[PDB]
């Protein structure tokens, strides 16, 4: 209702809450959909910036909670191209390396980057439920190598 | 039997295998209605894959394994066009593979052991597992043995003709030489 | 009771272990029209397992663990040969 307003601001901000609790819910891709339609929507706009600078980040890491790791990286891919901000931002240093870690199957890589990422941008509990469902995921897949 | 069948080209999403037996028959899961079993489907003209049954996988749909779908360069729910690819029509008479190179890599960096594998072993079970399929060079693959998951990456592929005493063709690395896998050829792995 | 046991040999498929329960028992499960319940089974005159009853694996068909795999160096559907064992005789 917002957005049929032309509200883009407060319908972001119902769009940020819609898609935390959807990715905190099992629902990844539904939450990197809306993820996608934040970016789009605030793509242009200097006040949004650095949301957007998390948007891409929060995407992928909900294609990544998804098994998708080949949508993270044109996730990623798109956002470096798209938004120069991101490309040089820590988040997207930090997106590739989970990328990479996935790639190879290396949980203990992953954590390691996560407590980099820690060190110097403090994660926040929703960051930490996607990434120990990731780490579960390769839990998983160590299951499936049996 | 390509002497009768359709070759229109079909427009199929990749999707996630439906388990781990199809990624390890190296067969691209499709729906009874896509596609007839057993037949070699090639995909960007570039991938020949061997059709599997599925009914997991509903009808427009191509299912993948996750080292077929990298070596692919695809993204899950991303459109690719098949068709039915005639070996025979396509290579004339260097149908057969005269020499397949395999590195074999450890799927599990963590799960590596010092013992001395034979490669003759290695040789029996994947042409077990994956005898009259279409190869190329550079395919990545996915093979059980002894309870270790390996990956195995074809090096280099040589293409003979069934009849050619001396191998006369020169090893060809590019994706475009391709042979069905036989017991007579000659398999080398290496790291 | 060991006395009376259909001795004939088996030819049976190498699968993954039904769940994670039958992997911590190490008894090979079979199926009832397999072999009796409870009974020691050799296979390849080698490798010695106690069987239990399951009706998840159909018959002709033997299920193993993945260290047991390592101990015989077997790959996923591999035929082993199985017989009934006799450790006292």
Same mark, same amino acid.
């Given at each position: 209702?917002?957005? +049929?307003? +032309?509200?883009? !601001?407060?319908?972001?901000? *119902?769009?940020?809450? *819609?898609?935390?609790?959807?990715? #905190?819910?099992?629902?990844?891709?539904?939450?990197?959909?809306?993820?996608?339609?934040?970016?789009?929507?605030?793509?242009?706009?200097?006040?949004?910036?650095?949301?957007?600078?998390?948007?891409?980040?929060?995407?992928?890491?909900?294609?990544? !909670?998804?098994?998708?790791?080949?949508? !993270?990286?044109?996730?990623?891919?798109?956002?470096?191209?798209?938004?120069?901000?991101?490309?040089?931002?820590?988040?997207?240093?930090? #997106?590739?390396?989970?990328?990479? !870690?996935?790639?190879?199957?290396?949980?203990?890589?992953?954590?390691?980057? *996560?407590?980099?990422?820690?060190?110097?941008?403090?994660?926040?509990?929703?960051?930490?439920?996607?990434?120990?469902?990731?780490?579960?995921?390769? +839990?998983?897949?160590?299951?499936?190598?049996? | 039997?390509?002497?009768?069948?359709?070759?229109?080209?079909?427009?199929?999403?990749?999707?996630?295998?439906?388990?781990?037996?199809?990624?390890?028959?190296?067969?691209?899961?499709?729906?009874?209605?896509?596609?007839?079993?057993? %037949?070699?489907?090639?995909?960007?003209?570039?991938?020949?894959?061997?059709?599997?049954?599925?009914?997991?996988?509903?009808? $427009?749909?191509? $299912?993948?394994?996750?080292? =077929?779908?990298?070596?692919?360069?695809?993204?899950?729910?991303?459109?690719?066009?098949?068709?039915?690819?005639?070996?025979?029509?396509?290579?004339?008479?260097?149908?057969?593979? $005269?020499?397949?190179?395999?590195?074999?890599?450890?799927?599990?960096? $963590?799960?590596?052991?010092? /013992?001395?594998?034979?490669?003759?072993?290695?040789?029996?079970?994947?042409?077990?597992?994956?005898?009259? =399929? %279409?190869?190329?060079?550079? =395919?990545?693959?996915?093979?059980?043995? =002894?309870?270790?998951?390996?990956?195995?990456?074809?090096?280099?592929?040589?293409? %003979?003709?069934?009849?050619?005493?001396?191998? /006369?063709?020169?090893?060809? /690395?590019? %994706?475009?030489?391709?042979?069905?896998?036989?017991?007579?050829?000659?398999?080398?792995?290496?790291?």
């Amino acid at each position: 209702w917002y957005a +049929q307003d +032309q509200s883009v !601001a407060l319908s972001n901000k *119902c769009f940020i809450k *819609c898609a935390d609790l959807k990715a #905190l819910d099992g629902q990844y891709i539904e939450a990197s959909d809306i993820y996608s339609k934040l970016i789009k929507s605030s793509m242009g706009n200097r006040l949004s910036q650095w949301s957007l600078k998390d948007y891409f980040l929060k995407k992928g890491l909900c294609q990544l !909670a998804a098994t998708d790791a080949v949508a !993270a990286a044109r996730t990623l891919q798109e956002g470096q191209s798209e938004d120069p901000n991101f490309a040089d931002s820590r988040e997207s240093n930090f #997106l590739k390396s989970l990328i990479d !870690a996935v790639n190879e199957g290396d949980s203990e890589q992953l954590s390691e980057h *996560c407590k980099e990422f820690d060190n110097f941008m403090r994660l926040d509990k929703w960051k930490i439920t996607i990434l120990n469902k990731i780490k579960e995921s390769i +839990q998983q897949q160590e299951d499936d190598l049996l | 039997d390509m002497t009768n069948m359709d070759t229109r080209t079909r427009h199929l999403k990749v999707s996630n295998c439906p388990n781990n037996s199809y990624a390890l028959a190296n067969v691209a899961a499709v729906s009874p209605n896509d596609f007839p079993n057993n %037949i070699y489907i090639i995909i960007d003209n570039l991938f020949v894959f061997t059709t599997r049954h599925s009914n997991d996988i509903p009808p $427009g749909t191509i $299912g993948f394994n996750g080292n =077929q779908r990298t070596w692919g360069g695809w993204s899950l729910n991303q459109d690719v066009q098949a068709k039915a690819f005639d070996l025979f029509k396509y290579s004339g008479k260097q149908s057969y593979l $005269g020499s397949i190179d395999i590195d074999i890599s450890f799927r599990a960096r $963590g799960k590596a052991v010092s /013992t001395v594998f034979d490669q003759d072993e290695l040789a029996k079970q994947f042409v077990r597992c994956y005898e009259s =399929q %279409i190869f190329s060079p550079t =395919q990545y693959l996915i093979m059980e043995f =002894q309870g270790h998951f390996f990956d195995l990456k074809i090096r280099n592929v040589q293409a %003979i003709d069934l009849g050619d005493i001396e191998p /006369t063709s020169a090893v060809a /690395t590019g %994706i475009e030489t391709k042979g069905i896998l036989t017991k007579q050829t000659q398999i080398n792995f290496f790291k």
